[PDB]
From Swiss-Prot, chain A:
<dbReference type="GO" id="GO:0140297">
    <property type="term" value="F:DNA-binding transcription factor binding"/>
</dbReference>
<dbReference type="GO" id="GO:0006357">
    <property type="term" value="P:regulation of transcription by RNA polymerase II"/>
</dbReference>
<dbReference type="GO" id="GO:0005524">
    <property type="term" value="F:ATP binding"/>
</dbReference>
<keyword id="KW-0539">Nucleus</keyword>
<feature type="modified residue" description="N6-acetyllysine">
    <location>
        <position position="64"/>
    </location>
</feature>
Swiss-Prot record, chain B:
<dbReference type="GO" id="GO:0000502">
    <property type="term" value="C:proteasome complex"/>
</dbReference>
<dbReference type="GO" id="GO:0005654">
    <property type="term" value="C:nucleoplasm"/>
</dbReference>
<dbReference type="GO" id="GO:0005829">
    <property type="term" value="C:cytosol"/>
</dbReference>
<feature type="modified residue" description="Phosphoserine">
    <location>
        <position position="56"/>
    </location>
</feature>
<dbReference type="Pfam" id="PF00227">
    <property type="entry name" value="Proteasome"/>
</dbReference>
Swiss-Prot record, chain G:
<dbReference type="GO" id="GO:0000932">
    <property type="term" value="C:P-body"/>
</dbReference>
<feature type="modified residue" description="Phosphoserine">
    <location>
        <position position="170"/>
    </location>
</feature>
<dbReference type="GO" id="GO:0019773">
    <property type="term" value="C:proteasome core complex, alpha-subunit complex"/>
</dbReference>
<dbReference type="Pfam" id="PF10584">
    <property type="entry name" value="Proteasome_A_N"/>
</dbReference>
<feature type="modified residue" description="Phosphoserine">
    <location>
        <position position="72"/>
    </location>
</feature>
UniProtKB/Swiss-Prot annotation, chain H:
<dbReference type="GO" id="GO:0000502">
    <property type="term" value="C:proteasome complex"/>
</dbReference>
<keyword id="KW-0449">Lipoprotein</keyword>
<dbReference type="GO" id="GO:0003723">
    <property type="term" value="F:RNA binding"/>
</dbReference>
<keyword id="KW-0209">Deafness</keyword>
<dbReference type="GO" id="GO:0005634">
    <property type="term" value="C:nucleus"/>
</dbReference>
Length: 228, 228, 239, 377, 51, 219, 248, 370
């Protein structure tokens, strides 16, 4: 809903912004742990707002598709003005350096907006605080790790469209997970399906999830370091 | 690199005592003149604020009743040498019933001019002009943080001491008289300074055989200012 | 040459750590202090109470001797070391000589110990700047300032912290000779400086006075509210 | 909104019915006689053969060929490495032309004469006389060098304070050059590729050898190379090979001839003794600060081109500017002129000179680094 | 031969692929028969551990 | 197999190539260092190898080599960097100079100014055979060179060159040549007569331009 | 060539070991001292709550230091044990000196000087420990102070611990009580604090610790209270959650 | 609504912009021209009516110009028109407008003029008599014959209005403007920065008198990257090419060098010296009075009741900027549209005030040494 307010409302209603005469937001910084749907979120929003979703990370391939890799990235301004409903996403001081110059000329030194850049990462402090100037970055939005009910709903999404056993429970598994990502639960579901397949079955039993939580359990282990 | 107290230059000496003699030049200037009638002396105070009380800043201090002083650079280190030097002269009177000769005072300070030790602290950055009248009549002395002491006929220090010593060598001879050296000295002062020559900028230090006491002029200093 | 060890100099002969010690002094809280002819008076700004603690422990103004008045700049706990050190020192001078302990001697102690303390090796220098008010020699009002290099220095009025040149320029625009010997006009002068505080919050001001024979008298934020009342009323008189 | 929108609709309605209201022999026959002319593809020569032309030639890219001249040639000057005209069909040679010089290195010949006068570099008169002796005297009047049997120096090194007149001397010779002066920036050898700067030095001295009795100036020679640093990392390499190539193609194994090089730097200390050795550069003519009334001479230079008060002096501000550079001097003179431009006046005053001395030396020679501490005085 | 770079000089790419011609085609799936590869060097420390 | 010229850069190593190329009438060949390593990769193998073919077909081949250490480099194994084609052309010079398929008609002369950038394999035991350092003119060779270069000018012969070589310490023949030429131009400051002894004296005084008057602390 | 900073400012002018020490402080358990006039309390959080332990220590964060004074702690454990043994040595020496207990403030500032000397000179690793102070005197009664690695301290009524307790301190300002010395309402309020901020499901007593310090007639006794009253504080506070869901 | 007038004038300007034999000898020149007019590239010019050209692959020819367009239009390194028959030079071609011009040569006077200021009109006077008076009225330089100041340094806190002044001088302009970000001078190649300097100020030189503005120029001296071949011994050489470019030779011309930093201390005093840059200009945070002017500008075109005093936003925070005040305006608008109102009331300035000032108004992690 925060991204609906900060991104959809520039798309849906510039008349309300210009009705009182304000400056719309143009840079939304997203932070949080990996696997928390950093890219699924912006792709779902850009999909349902009908903006060209762009991802320029680091490649000479991508520089060759922007220009020819000649001098800079700012022909992305050409392909963004010509696709002026443009939502851009970036990854984790080089990508941040390019983001510095792109924000150096999109802030008031440009044309018709709905051209917005979006970066989701952790470790907020290593990027620039002059980049974190309040006239440059407004909405630093956190990504919570999924709780028991959130991993329950993520479990129902990533488990719903499969072939499950007649007779199944999911809140048990959501309490088995001590915190996963948006994609680790998918590995629980699919590799539990492999656990049914090695049992020559297509219905995924609860025991298949008991071995699948045992499979994803290898991420964190190693006690007797109970300092701090 | 920046070999400090324990490394010579590949040609000469310490890059740190060179930094101390370098660190003399930032200080204000002072000109003492050995007249056979009596060593006079002056200094630029360089008063900044109106709140900045003029007599609060000292440059001439009275070691012995016929011995004034003059500093160039590091203030409380110089004043430490002042108090300790007064102790040493008090030891010479204490064990000899007589004043320590001013050159031997300068050798006594000049012993620990270079006895800086961080092992077995830092070297100092203040150059000194000494006015006295010993048994050989008037004496005008100049030492350095490097301890290379020399008796000087008339010495300028601090800022602009090149042209001050040069014009001093123009105006100086052996048979100079007292008030001649006074008004000529303040001529060189208002040459080398940038402020309007008033009572606040300068102060005098006049030792004589008949006027061993009172290395100072009090508001007839103002009269000699309006004598030029 | 580098901005590291307090021992070495720059190629033009500088001490960057003394300069960096002046930085936290300049980034400290603001405090002002003037001498009356009889009633010397001072006050720190930016009390900034946070709803859940006591503030008698955070009191930044004390006394070594009853004739003298303490203030500082920079951080707190190093100044606590200097304060208790100079309680031992002023009390020791009291023990040796039965004089009232003088501001010039104790500031030679503090500036000297800060100096040789800066000289000694592997020792983090005091990032403070003290403000020392004493009216002792027949109650002759005196106020000194210190330095992170350790140079004791007399002024006639003083202001420290952030905007010290601004409030100091206000005192240059406010330095009347009649503000003293009309100690109520010295009170209006202190209310003029606290009025010319960088925030001038009215409740974050803490003032203390002495009539050179009295003790350190702590004011109230209702008398001071009346001082802001006569300040705004005198501004209405200027209108 | 009604004024701007209505006036804009008025202008648009004006342009609408305006858009609806809208609806040599200089050389031509000679060019028609140039249609029976020829395309004349120039090529490159590898070598000839004995007693006969039998020339072996690549074009540049295609292939290599045994070919023959057309009989309208000078049949001797079709020598090796010579770019010549070649027919499309018959592959016959017509005329040799001078070859490829460079793409962008032809563009550093100065091709002009800047009006920097020897009188304008006052205060360094020994440098003026020795520079006159090395540069100007052999290249125009070999009346005493050859007539006794002595040589002029070929290289002269220049340094000093920044703001002294390395630019003034280098552009001062170009007023009275009598020679093809050539500009060289030391960062011109900052290329990307390996040994490209060696080819730059090649075509540099090839430009030097075709024309006779000419000038080349080196500027900021610190980027050309400091020393012969050695480590286990492979650092300064292209700069080093280009530097040694500048030594060898500078001089040695048949020397430069009648060309003169002035070098210039600000750090003469960190240089290599293969450059510092004489034979390459003989008179190391250094520069110094204006310490005397040469300052007043520069004041006369920077004051003669402007209306001033006739009752002014220059020795006072000269004593006020002991360690000053001439660029700071011109900032004082022209800046005092800018105070006169702030005025309604037409002649500046000595008080305006005090405004520029007291303005530049105090607000832009003491406020650069701000002192916020006494601690000294 | 070399060892490896971190993608520096662009011609060293072609040096690396030309070296991986040897790294594959000395091994391949089709082995060599009676192909005695005699090697000589000055400092064998700078060689590729792939070789 | 191979003669090495190393030592100070003012001793004269162009002098022996120009001198013995001037006297001997064999096929004399020159070579510079950075002219070998080119912009594209592998052109120096063509240039060195074709040079060996051309000198090989010109059998009394005397190859002079100027700035041998410009390509002669103590190589290194590291990561992230490295200029290798220096060692490519250098190893082309090594194997095509010596090793398999030896020749009996190459004559190798080299001239450097510093030594220890070179690989030990670059000389080893006769990649260059003779290790010939060049000394400085001790005392008599200084006045000898001053006589050689002062042979051409017209001299009023009231000049003891042994005073001048005795007072001038550790110069090269180029600095002695600077003494003679600048002595000629100091004689041209008068412009009237021939070379006086004082002309040599003041020309020396320009060449003795070490004037570091930093006599501080030393009193 | 092997020197850390240990006594030097960061470049611009800030501090290094102090900030990283506070970062070590934020990653710890949570404690609190609450507003009480008739005594004072401390809640605490058990760390390393694995079942195969013994738990016969009866005091893990709590240190009853002299007679009427205790301290919860946050930081390096055995370093803190050095500081508690040294602390009892100091105040016990004061009790030797006057045969009178400490006024506690010069004790707190004294330990702040102890860590502070390690901050200035003798460039070692300083103590990355912040810790509480409860007590009583004849001059101000029951007291609350906060140790700092910077040599600073706080005379508080509602204290602060690190990352787990910033929301707790916002709960203390937004839910700040004043005037009532009711220890049990402070226990329900602290049960709300550890209920939200402590992420233990249903507030298990084996993950928490509570001990108070009340006035008894000249003794000023210290109630290191047991677990069953913590259990009825759990059932009582969940009954307060039932009262909270009466509005549903 | 007026959207009918706006869209009507827009479509009218679009169609009017879309509104874009008798001469026999001109048709004769068109007959001298081939129908496949090929394109060539010059190498040198020989005076005998024909020169040497260069093909696309490099076949190179001694071909003649159709002598009605001028050969003085031809320079070495210009694209021409060639025949296929005798490959003769057909005529002058309009030159290639590169991304250097189409990105850097800003044709637009961007935003508001000198009514966008706060605490100015001394620095407006300095940029006026230092740039505008050498530009617009350089007749005082005829009245005395004195050189103009050359370069301008802007420095101060971030968000001061270096951007605002740069776009104000970019508004009031008659010279061709160029803008460069100082972080753009370090690339993943060897010898790129100096080439960017040479072609940069070459393009700044060829067209007209020009105004070159480069901002954040300190980001080459205090920044390091792994995305950099070589390092400080390529950065130093880039500073040397900027050094000889800024203090070069041969009549530098009417190119106003205007540069902006935040910090001043880490810069080259050989670039601080006069002769390169004569107008070093202090940017402080002006005063608390023209705060109200920046409130008046940034609230001048928005619906807003009285509901506040600007002194409430004066005795709140010591530093002052259009970045501060503008964030109060925009965040107050976010609170107003968050509360779906117009005519913004006080509490939006209150929570906007605390949100902006906390937003950056803080320090390090509390306590420290308050
Ligand atoms: N002696 C002088 N007389 C007259 N003008 C001078 C003098 N010295 C310097 N100038 C002035 O300073 C400049 C001379 O060029 P300058 O000395 O700065 O070249 P430079 O030595 O190459 O400096 P840099 O190594 O910084 O590029 C001109 O602007 C000129 O007006
Ligand atoms: N033994 C000598 N006899 C005569 N002249 C000499 C002698 N040694 C040196 N010279 C003079 O000094 C110069 C030194 O020779 P030159 O500079 O051409 O070679 P080089 O550069 O010193 O060799 P390198 O620098 O590779 O060691 C010559 O120009 C010559 O006039």
């Amino acid at each position: 809903k925060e991204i609906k307010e900060v991104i959809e409302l520039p798309v849906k209603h510039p008349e309300l912004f210009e009705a009182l005469g304000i400056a719309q937001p143009k840079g939304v910084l997203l932070y949080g742990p990996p696997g928390t749907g950093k890219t699924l979120l912006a792709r779902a929003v850009a999909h349902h707002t009908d903006c060209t979703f762009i991802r320029v990370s680091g490649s000479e391939l991508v520089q060759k598709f922007i220009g020819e890799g000649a001098r800079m990235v700012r022909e992305l301004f050409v392909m963004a003005r010509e696709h002026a409903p443009s939502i851009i996403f970036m990854d984790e001081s080089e990508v941040q350096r390019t983001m510095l110059e792109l924000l150096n000329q999109l802030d008031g030194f440009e044309a018709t907006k709905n051209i917005k850049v979006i970066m989701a990462t952790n470790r907020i402090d290593i990027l620039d605080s002059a980049l974190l100037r309040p006239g440059r970055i407004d909405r630093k939005i956190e990504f919570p790790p999924p709780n028991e009910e959130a991993r329950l709903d993520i479990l129902k999404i990533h488990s719903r469209k499969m072939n499950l056993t007649r007779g199944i429970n999911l809140r048990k598994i959501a309490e088995l997970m001590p915190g996963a990502s948006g994609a680790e639960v998918k590995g629980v579901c699919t590799e539990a399906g492999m656990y049914a397949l090695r049992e020559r079955r297509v219905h995924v039993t609860q025991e298949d999830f008991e071995m699948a939580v045992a499979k994803v359990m290898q991420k964190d282990s190693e006690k007797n370091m109970s300092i701090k | 690199y920046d070999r400090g107290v324990n490394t010579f230059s590949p040609e000469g000496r310490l890059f740190q005592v060179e930094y101390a003699i370098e660190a003399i030049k930032l200080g204000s200037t002072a000109i003492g003149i050995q007249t056979s009638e009596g060593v006079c002396l002056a200094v630029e105070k360089r008063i900044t604020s109106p709140l900045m009380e003029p007599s609060s800043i000292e440059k001439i201090v009275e070691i012995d009743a016929h011995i004034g002083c003059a500093m160039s650079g590091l203030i409380a280190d110089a004043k430490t040498l002042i108090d300790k030097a007064r102790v040493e002269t008090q030891n010479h009177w204490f064990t000899y019933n007589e004043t320590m000769t001013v050159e031997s005072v300068t050798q006594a300070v000049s012993n620990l001019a270079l006895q800086f030790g961080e092992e077995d602290s830092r070297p100092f950055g203040v150059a000194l002009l000494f006015g006295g009248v010993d048994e050989k009549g008037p004496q005008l002395f100049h030492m350095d943080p490097s301890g290379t002491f020399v008796q000087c006929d008339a010495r300028a220090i601090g800022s602009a001491s090149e042209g001050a010593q040069s014009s001093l060598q123009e105006v100086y001879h052996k048979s100079m008289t007292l008030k001649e050296a006074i008004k000529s000295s303040l001529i060189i002062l208002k040459q080398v300074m940038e402020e309007k020559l008033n009572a606040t900028n300068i102060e005098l230090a006049t030792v004589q055989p008949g006027q061993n006491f009172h290395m100072f002029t009090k508001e007839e200093l103002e009269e000699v200012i309006k004598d030029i | 040459s580098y901005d590291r060890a307090i021992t070495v100099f720059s190629p033009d002969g500088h001490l960057f750590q003394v300069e960096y010690a002046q930085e936290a002094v300049k980034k400290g809280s603001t405090a002002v202090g003037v001498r009356g002819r009889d009633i010397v008076v001072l006050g720190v700004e930016k009390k900034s109470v946070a709803k859940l603690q006591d503030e008698r422990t955070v009191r930044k103004i004390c006394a070594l001797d009853d004739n003298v008045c303490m203030a500082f700049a920079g951080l707190t706990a190093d100044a606590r070391i200097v304060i208790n050190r100079a309680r031992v020192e002023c009390q020791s001078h009291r023990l040796t000589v039965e004089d009232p302990v003088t501001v010039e001697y104790i500031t030679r102690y503090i500036a000297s110990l800060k100096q040789r303390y800066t000289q000694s090796n592997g020792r983090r220098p005091f990032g403070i700047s003290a403000l020392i008010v004493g009216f002792d020699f027949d109650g002759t009002p005196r106020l000194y300032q210190t330095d992170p290099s350790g140079t004791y220095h007399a002024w006639k009025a003083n202001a420290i912290g952030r905007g010290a040149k601004s409030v100091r320029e206000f005192l240059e625009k406010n330095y009347t000779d009649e503000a003293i010997e009309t100690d109520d006009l010295t009170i209006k002068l202190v209310i003029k400086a606290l009025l010319e505080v960088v925030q001038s919050g009215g409740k974050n001001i803490e003032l203390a006075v002495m009539r050179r024979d009295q003790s350190l008298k702590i004011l109230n934020p209702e008398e001071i509210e009346k001082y802001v009342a006569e300040i705004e009323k005198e501004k209405e008189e200027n209108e | 909104d009604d004024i701007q929108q209505l006036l804009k609709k008025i202008n648009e309605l004006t342009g609408i019915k305006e858009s609806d209201t809208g609806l040599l022999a200089a050389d031509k026959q000679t060019l028609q006689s140039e249609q029976p002319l020829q395309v004349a593809r120039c090529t490159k020569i590898i070598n000839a053969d004995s007693e006969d032309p039998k020339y072996i030639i690549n074009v540049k890219q295609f292939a290599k060929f045994v070919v023959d001249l057309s009989d309208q040639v000078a049949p001797t000057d079709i020598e090796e490495g010579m770019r010549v005209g070649v027919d499309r069909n018959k592959y016959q040679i017509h005329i040799p032309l001078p070859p490829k010089i460079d793409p962008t290195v032809t563009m550093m010949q100065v091709e002009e004469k800047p009006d920097v006068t020897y009188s304008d570099v006052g205060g360094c008169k020994e440098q003026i006389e020795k520079l006159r002796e090395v540069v100007e005297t052999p290249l125009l009047h070999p009346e005493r060098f050859v007539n006794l049997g002595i040589e002029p120096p070929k290289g002269v090194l220049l340094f000093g304070p920044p703001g002294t007149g390395k630019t003034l001397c280098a552009r001062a010779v170009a007023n009275r050059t009598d020679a093809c002066f050539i500009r060289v920036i030391g960062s011109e050898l900052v290329q990307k590729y390996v040994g490209e700067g060696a080819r730059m030095v090649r075509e540099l001295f090839e430009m030097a050898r075709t024309k006779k009795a000419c000038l080349i100036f080196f500027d900021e020679i610190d980027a050309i190379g400091g020393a012969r640093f050695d480590d286990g990392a492979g650092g300064d390499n292209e700069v080093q090979r280009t530097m040694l190539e500048l030594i060898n193609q500078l001089d040695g194994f048949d020397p430069r001839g009648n060309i003169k090089v002035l070098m210039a730097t600000n750090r003469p200390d960190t240089l290599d003794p293969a450059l510092m050795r004489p034979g390459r550069l003989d008179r190391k003519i250094e520069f110094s600060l204006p310490d005397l009334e040469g300052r007043t001479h520069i004041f006369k230079i920077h004051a003669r081109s402007m209306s001033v008060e006739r009752d002014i002096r220059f020795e006072l501000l000269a004593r006020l500017c002991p360690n000053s550079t001439g660029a700071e001097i011109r900032s004082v003179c022209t800046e005092a002129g800018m105070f006169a431009i702030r005025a309604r006046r037409k002649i500046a005053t000595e008080k305006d000179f005090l405004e520029a001395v007291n303005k530049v030396i105090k607000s832009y020679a003491k406020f650069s680094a701000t002192p916020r501490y006494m601690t000294y005085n | 031969g070399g060892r490896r770079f971190s993608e520096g000089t662009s011609a060293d790419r072609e040096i690396q692929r030309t070296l991986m011609e040897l790294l594959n085609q000395m091994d391949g799936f089709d082995t060599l028969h009676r192909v005695k590869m005699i090697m000589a060097t000055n400092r064998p420390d700078t060689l590729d551990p792939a070789l | 197999k191979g003669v090495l010229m190393y030592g100070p850069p003012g001793t004269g190593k162009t002098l022996l190539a120009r001198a013995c190329a001037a006297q001997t009438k064999a096929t004399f060949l020159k070579l510079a260092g950075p002219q070998l390593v080119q912009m594209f990769i592998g052109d120096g193998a063509k240039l060195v190898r074709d040079a060996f073919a051309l000198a090989k077909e010109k059998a009394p081949s005397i190859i002079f080599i100027d700035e041998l250490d410009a390509i002669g480099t103590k190589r290194f194994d590291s990561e992230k960097a490295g200029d290798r084609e220096v060692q490519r052309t250098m190893l082309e010079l090594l194997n095509q100079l010596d090793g398999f398929q030896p020749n009996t008609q190459v004559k190798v002369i080299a001239a450097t100014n510093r030594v220890d950038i070179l690989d030990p394999a670059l000389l080893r035991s006769g990649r260059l055979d003779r290790k010939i350092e060049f000394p400085m003119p001790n005392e008599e060779a200084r006045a000898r060179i001053m006589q050689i270069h002062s042979r051409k000018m017209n001299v009023s012969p009231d000049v003891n060159y042994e005073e001048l070589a005795r007072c001038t310490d550790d110069f090269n023949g180029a600095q002695c040549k600077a003494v003679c030429v600048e002595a000629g131009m100091i004689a041209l400051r008068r412009g009237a007569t021939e070379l006086t002894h004082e002309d040599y004296m003041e020309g020396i005084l320009e060449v003795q331009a070490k004037k570091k008057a930093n006599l501080q602390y030393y009193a | 060539r092997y020197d850390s900073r240990t006594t030097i400012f960061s470049p611009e002018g800030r501090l290094y070991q102090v900030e990283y020490a506070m970062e070590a402080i934020g990653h710890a358990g949570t404690c609190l001292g609450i507003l009480a006039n008739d005594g004072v309390l401390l809640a605490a959080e058990r760390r390393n709550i694995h079942k195969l332990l013994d738990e016969v220590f009866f005091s893990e964060k709590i240190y009853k230091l002299n007679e009427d004074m205790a301290c919860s702690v946050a930081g390096i454990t055995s370093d803190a044990n050095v500081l508690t043994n040294e602390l009892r040595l100091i105040a016990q020496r004061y009790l030797l000196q006057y045969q009178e207990p400490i006024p506690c403030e010069q004790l707190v500032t004294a330990l702040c000087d102890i860590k502070q000397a390690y901050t200035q000179f003798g460039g070692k690793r300083p103590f990355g420990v912040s810790l509480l102070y409860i007590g009583w005197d004849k001059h101000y009664g029951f007291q609350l102070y906060q140790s700092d690695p910077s040599g600073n301290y706080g005379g508080w009524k509602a204290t602060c611990i690190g990352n787990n307790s910033a929301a707790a301190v916002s709960m203390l300002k937004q839910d700040y009580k004043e005037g009532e010395m009711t220890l049990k309402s402070a226990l329900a309020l602290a049960i709300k604090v550890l209920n939200k901020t402590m992420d233990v499901s249903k507030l298990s007593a084996e993950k928490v610790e509570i001990a108070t310090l009340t006035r008894e007639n000249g003794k000023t006794v210290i109630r290191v209270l047991k677990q069953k009253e913590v259990e009825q504080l759990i059932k009582k506070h969940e009954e307060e959650e039932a009262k909270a869901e009466r509005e549903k | 609504l007026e959207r009918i007038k706006d869209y009507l004038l827009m479509e009218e300007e679009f169609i009017r912009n879309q509104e874009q034999k008798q001469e026999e000898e001109r048709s004769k020149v068109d007959d001298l021209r081939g129908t496949p007019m090929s394109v060539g590239t010059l190498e040198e010019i020989i005076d005998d009516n024909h020169a040497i050209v260069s093909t696309s692959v490099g076949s190179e020819h001694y071909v003649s110009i159709l002598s009605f367009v001028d050969k003085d239009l031809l320079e070495p390194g210009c694209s021409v028109l060639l025949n296929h028959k005798v490959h003769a030079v057909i005529g002058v071609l309009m030159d290639d407008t590169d991304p250097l011009v189409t990105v850097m040569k800003v044709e637009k006077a961007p935003q508001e003029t000198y009514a966008d200021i706060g605490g100015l009109d001394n620095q407006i006077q300095e940029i006026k008599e230092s740039v505008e008076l050498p530009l617009t009225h350089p007749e005082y330089y005829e009245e005395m014959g004195i050189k103009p100041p050359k370069g301008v340094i802007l420095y101060g806190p971030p968000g001061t209005g270096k951007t605002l002044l740069a776009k104000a001088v970019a508004n009031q302009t008659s010279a061709t403007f160029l803008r460069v970000v100082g972080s753009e001078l370090i690339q993943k190649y060897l010898g790129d920065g100096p080439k960017l300097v040479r072609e940069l100020f070459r393009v700044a030189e060829e067209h007209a008198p020009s105004i070159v503005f480069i901002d954040e120029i300190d980001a080459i001296g205090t920044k390091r990257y792994d995305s950099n071949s070589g390092g400080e011994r390529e950065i130093q050489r880039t500073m040397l090419e900027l050094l000889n470019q800024l203090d070069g030779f041969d009549s530098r011309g009417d190119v106003k060098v205007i540069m902006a930093t935040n910090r001043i201390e880490t810069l080259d005093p050989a670039l601080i010296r006069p002769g390169r840059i004569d107008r070093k200009i202090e940017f402080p945070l002006p005063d608390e009075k023209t705060k109200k002017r920046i409130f008046q500008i940034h609230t001048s075109r928005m619906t807003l009741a009285d509901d506040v005093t600007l002194d409430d936003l004066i005795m709140a925070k010591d530093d002052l900027s259009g970045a501060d005040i503008k964030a109060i305006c925009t965040e107050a608008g976010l609170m107003a549209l968050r509360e779906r109102r117009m005519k913004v009331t006080n509490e939006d300035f209150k929570k906007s005030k605390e949100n902006v000032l906390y937003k950056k108004q803080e320090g390090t992690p509390e306590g420290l040494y308050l």
